[PDB]
Design an enzyme around this catalytic site. Structure first.
Site, short mmCIF file in Angstrom:
data_model
loop_
_atom_site.label_atom_id
_atom_site.label_comp_id
_atom_site.label_asym_id
_atom_site.label_seq_id
_atom_site.Cartn_x
_atom_site.Cartn_y
_atom_site.Cartn_z
N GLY A 45 -10.35 23.07 -9.41
CA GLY A 45 -9.22 22.30 -9.27
C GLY A 45 -8.21 22.36 -7.95
O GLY A 45 -8.69 22.89 -6.82
N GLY A 47 -4.32 22.32 -6.33
CA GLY A 47 -2.96 22.49 -7.13
C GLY A 47 -1.95 21.85 -5.70
O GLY A 47 -2.62 21.43 -5.02
N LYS A 48 -0.83 22.42 -5.60
CA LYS A 48 0.13 21.77 -4.50
C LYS A 48 -0.31 22.19 -3.24
O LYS A 48 0.09 21.59 -2.30
CB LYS A 48 1.66 22.02 -4.87
N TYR A 49 -0.86 23.47 -3.04
CA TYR A 49 -1.00 23.95 -1.74
C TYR A 49 -2.34 24.77 -1.72
O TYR A 49 -2.62 25.53 -0.73
CB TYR A 49 0.12 24.97 -1.36
N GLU A 51 -7.06 24.71 -3.42
CA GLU A 51 -8.11 24.30 -4.28
C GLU A 51 -8.54 25.74 -4.99
O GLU A 51 -8.79 26.61 -3.84
CB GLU A 51 -9.06 23.30 -3.96
N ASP A 155 6.76 31.63 -12.60
CA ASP A 155 5.84 30.62 -13.13
C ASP A 155 4.85 31.00 -14.18
O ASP A 155 3.91 30.68 -14.49
CB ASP A 155 4.66 30.27 -11.89
#
Ligand code: ANP
Ligand code: MG
Ligand code: MG
Length: 334
Positions: A45, A47-49, A51, A155
């Protein structure tokens, strides 16, 4: 009117009493492993910053996970790496196995132990009461550990806890929002998944500390034992607070804001309404009651407190009766 400052009531000066080199992840120069040791198998996958890929170490045929990183701040990369190395070997902390840079493009990747974790479905139908205490305990170890080592995870959520149920194996992952705690410092409230954001972040109080992770953990416990995921389901950050006030009630919400002289976006005032504190009992039904017990509710009650200074610490939580049969089993001879 200024807001009242706050400090962690535990582990407040851990970084204060360690060499600069421990917490100064900017000064740190990086020593790089070899990117040719690793073959990507499949993308897990984006994410924001980053893979994430499943990979194999070719020198030894072991599965690893590779997190390839943006041109992000060099600061973000170094922070995560420093925190990762500082915490390696700690219980239920994900091992950063290697660091690699593409020598031409110079784009960094992190190489982690692989965890063969159970589908976040299937667990849902099979976790017993004992299972939850146990895993809650293993999480608490990681969280006490990192807190004792001066680091907030920031997180905590179920997707960042990898559980290989056939091996009774748990790892706390994504250390990319994680940060060094320094007392008196003001942090970015843009952290944690919406559903796991503590009230301190929702009211934009920036002087928060490790207690934040205990809020997120509480939200996790609630969702595991009530079998409602996520337990507090707001549709944005504003609505997230309201989901909280709906259960914990507005009286303690406003006493909290009052105590820290916090003052709210006036919009919050209209949408917050007026809400009684509910009894935990209200959420217990035939389908979830085998996972519920009074020690479980008393435990949860001490996590989910508006006031960050009031929440159980990780080690107090490990002390709670809820874990009696877990600790009893784990006087481990080996
Ligand atoms: N060590 C691991 N073993 C197996 N699967 C993993 C591992 N680490 C990550 N994954 C998979 O990849 C996903 C993302 O990992 P994560 O480190 O949270 O990426 P991130 O983009 O930094 N976080 P976010 O910003 O919350 O999207 C997980 O939900 C897992 O499915
Ligand atoms: Mg993640
Ligand atoms: Mg992240």
């Amino acid at each position: 009117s200024g807001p009242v400052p706050s400090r962690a009531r535990v582990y407040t000066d851990v970084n204060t009493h360690r060499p600069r080199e421990y917490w100064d992840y900017e000064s740190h120069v990086v020593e790089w492993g070899n990117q040719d040791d690793y073959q990507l198998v499949r993308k897990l996958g984006r994410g924001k910053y980053s893979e994430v890929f499943e990979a194999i170490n070719i020198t030894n045929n072991e599965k690893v996970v590779v997190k390839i990183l943006k041109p992000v701040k060099k600061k973000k990369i170094k922070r995560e790496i420093k925190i990762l190395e500082n915490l390696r070997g700690g219980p239920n902390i994900i091992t950063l196995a290697d660091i690699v840079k593409d020598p031409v493009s110079r784009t960094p990747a992190l190489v982690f132990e692989h965890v063969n974790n159970t589908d976040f479905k299937q667990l849902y139908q099979t976790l017993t009461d004992y299972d939850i205490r146990f895993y809650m305990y293993e999480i608490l170890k990681a969280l006490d550990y990192c807190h004792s080592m001066g680091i907030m995870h920031r997180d905590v959520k179920p997707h960042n806890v990898m559980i290989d149920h056939e091996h009774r194996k748990l790892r706390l992952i994504d250390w990319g929002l994680a940060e060094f705690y320094h007392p008196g410092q003001e942090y970015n409230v843009r952290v944690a998944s919406r559903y796991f954001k503590g009230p301190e972040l929702l009211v934009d109080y920036q002087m928060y500390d490790y207690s934040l992770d205990m809020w997120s953990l509480g939200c996790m416990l609630a969702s595991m034992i009530f079998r409602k995921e996520p337990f507090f389901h707001g549709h944005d950050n504003y609505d997230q607070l309201v989901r909280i006030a709906k259960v914990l009630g507005t009286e303690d919400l406003y006493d909290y804001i009052d105590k820290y002289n916090i003052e709210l976006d006036p919009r919050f005032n209209d949408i917050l309404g007026r809400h009684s504190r509910k009894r935990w009992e209200r959420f217990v039904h035939s389908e979830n009651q085998h996972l519920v017990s009074p020690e479980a509710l008393d435990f949860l009650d001490k996590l989910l407190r508006y006031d960050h200074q009031s929440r159980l610490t990780a080690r107090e939580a490990m002390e709670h009766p809820y874990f009696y049969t877990v600790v009893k089993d784990q006087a481990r001879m080996g």
